Design a protein around this ligand. Sequence first.
Ligand code: MG
Ligand code: MG
Ligand code: MG
Ligand code: MG
Ligand code: MG
Ligand code: MG
Lengths: 35, 35, 35, 42, 42, 42
Amino acid sequence: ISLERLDVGTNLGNAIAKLEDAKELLESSDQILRS
Amino acid sequence: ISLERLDVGTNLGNAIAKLEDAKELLESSDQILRS
Amino acid sequence: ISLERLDVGTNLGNAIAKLEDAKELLESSDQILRS
Amino acid sequence: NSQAIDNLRASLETTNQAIEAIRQAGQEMILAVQGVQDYINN
Amino acid sequence: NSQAIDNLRASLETTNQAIEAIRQAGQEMILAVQGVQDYINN
Amino acid sequence: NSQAIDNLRASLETTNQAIEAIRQAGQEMILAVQGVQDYINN
Ligand SMILES: [Mg+2]
Ligand SMILES: [Mg+2]
Ligand SMILES: [Mg+2]
Ligand SMILES: [Mg+2]
Ligand SMILES: [Mg+2]
Ligand SMILES: [Mg+2]
């Protein structure tokens, strides 16, 4: 029997965290442009 | 028996649609710069 | 018996090569800005 | 001149919009990989 | 000055080129996920 | 004016930083797909 499951959630979570860091930087870029 | 197949084509199709929307925006950015 | 293994390494390698080409272009963009 | 400044700003706003579309593509690719993992585990 | 405008334009064109390379990486990642799905189904 | 040039440069540097974060997300997505392939093969 195998009690292991597939779990790539840490890399996918890291990817989401970085896409979210990118989102905040794009909003800050727009704030500078609007100013 | 299982009649289910793996199908992540809708998320991959959505990803392609967005990469293609991005392509058109990058071409429009270049058009403004060339002008 | 099946002697085939899953191998998407060529597409993943191509993706890495392009992320790396992008990195070098972002560094060149920064070099022009610093100047 | 004011056209050159307006065009640089408009190009950079358009570029920022393009990057957001790529960011959204990344989110959909992540959902696809999550769907592969769920299918294997289920 | 004209050097500052030329440098902003050149940097933004280089940045746009970098984004296109990331877009192409995304297309290759999608092909890889499609290849995982085909392997599982086949 | 000098504020307009400073703001365009600061916005473009911030945009370049955002693109690097998306590039890093891509690297993590690639590691996730490699982990799916390893799990299937192993
Ligand atoms: Mg964060
Ligand atoms: Mg805001
Ligand atoms: Mg579209
Ligand atoms: Mg054109
Ligand atoms: Mg290369
Ligand atoms: Mg350098």
